[PDB]
A paper describes a structure:
The MERS-CoV ORF4b protein is a viral accessory protein that functions as an innate immune inhibitor and strongly localizes to the nucleus, despite virus replication occurring exclusively within the cytoplasmic compartment. The MERS-CoV ORF4b protein has been shown to bind preferentially to the nuclear import adapter IMPα3 in infected cells, thereby inhibiting NF-κB-dependent innate immune responses. Here we provide a detailed, structural basis for the interaction between MERS-CoV ORF4b and its innate immune suppression target, the nuclear import adapter IMPα. Our results provide a detailed structural basis that explains how a virus can target the IMPα nuclear import adapter to impair immunity, and illustrate how small mutations in ORF4b, like those found in closely related coronaviruses such as HKU5, change the IMPα binding mechanism.
Finally, we examined the crystal structure of a MERS-CoV ORF4b Arg37 to Ala (R37A) mutant bound to IMPα2 and found that the major site was also disrupted and formed a Lys30 P2 register similar to the R24A and R33A mutants. E An Arg37Ala mutation, depicted as above, caused a change in binding at the major site to the canonical P2 Lys binding. In contrast, the R37A mutation reduced IMPα2 binding to a smaller extent (33 nM; ~3-fold reduction, not significant), whereas H26A exhibited IMPα2 binding affinity that was effectively unchanged compared to WT (~10 nM, not significant). For example, mutations within both the minor site (Arg24Ala), and the major site (Arg33Ala and Arg37Ala) resulted in the MERS-CoV ORF4b binding using a canonical Lys P2 involving 29TKKLR33, with Lys30 binding at the P2 site. These NLSs all bound with reduced affinity compared to the Arg P0 site.
Numbering used by the authors:
A (entry chain B): 21 to 25
B (entry chain C): 27 to 34
C (entry chain A): 72 to 496
Write the structure that this text describes.
Amino acid sequence: ARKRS
Amino acid sequence: SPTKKLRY
Amino acid sequence: GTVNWSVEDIVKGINSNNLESQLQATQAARKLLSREKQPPIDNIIRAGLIPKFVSFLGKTDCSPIQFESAWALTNIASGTSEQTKAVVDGGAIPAFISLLASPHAHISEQAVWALGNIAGDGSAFRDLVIKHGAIDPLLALLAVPDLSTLACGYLRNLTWTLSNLCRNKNPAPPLDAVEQILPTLVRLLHHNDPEVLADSCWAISYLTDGPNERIEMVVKKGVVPQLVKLLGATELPIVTPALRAIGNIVTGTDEQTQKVIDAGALAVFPSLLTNPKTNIQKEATWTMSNITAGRQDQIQQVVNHGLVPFLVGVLSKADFKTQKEAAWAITNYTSGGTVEQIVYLVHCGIIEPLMNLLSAKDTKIIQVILDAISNIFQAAEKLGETEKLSIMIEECGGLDKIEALQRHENESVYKASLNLIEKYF
């Protein structure tokens, strides 16, 4: 669960 | 928002 | 009078040594360049007129020709990168910066506009405008006790040009320029004009489109609550950039995302996730996907605000790109969430739409959905409810889709579907 730009 | 604008 | 001149006549007038004839020819050029259809920018450039206009910018003794040349050059600079470059190569940047301090408001405004076009070309001309010293006089124009005393169009043009100075990446604007501009941007973000608000939000969205240090520069100013307020606005030209800025901010650290949550942003997402404008729905679902990638207490605040049913809704029916953002939000949720949160997700009806989306052609959404299904099955394992979940997936028709994906071209989909079937079905 990592951020997506 | 536009990058450039012409004045009419 | 000065209407419908040929370029030949404009050249003849500008080449005369009569300042009044030059003024009339320059006004004719301005009117030609201000026409709706196909302004002959390239003809004016090829005529060699840019250096003359630039020299006229410096005629302090003849404000009308300053204004006419500034307008003509503004409109030349409004075109392609080659035409903007023609304006810059003529020396226009320092001349326009010198005009920013003109005692004539319409001349100062025209210089603001021209510098906005130049900076809006891209990061190189943006940084060149900055290096010539535009920020100090620009911001001095806005150093008044109450912005409401300024003319509306003047203030809108200043806000727009500042937003262009905040715009573009590779590289992003210089850190010191951003620090210099941000306070005036906060003030403008509290202004009442819808166009000023829209362009201030756009500027903030540019400044938050980057690494966590840029986001931090912005959030330190305390603007997140005002951004959430604007997120609740009725004017879509305001909601769009406000939502972009909030999404950018939640791409940062968990603490910055928490600043967004504490300001009350989640309470707006029932409307945003059902907004009739597809772009708003997509951006809001992307923002949600980055919030569900956060801490378990942040996932819990998503739950408490009743947003899981809205994610089920978007997954069930929406434009396909929004549905892909929702699939991402669900996979992040299941990757970071507790067992109780995941079972709640199942109780809200996620399985059926998640399985219906497995019929899509996009391989990445299939991978995302299979990862989410694996996470949900792992929670079920912890509860000994794997059989109920398998029966649910089989009843909605997902087992057929998974066994069909077993013959998928991509290796990851192949292997994940095989694992699911061999482990739970």
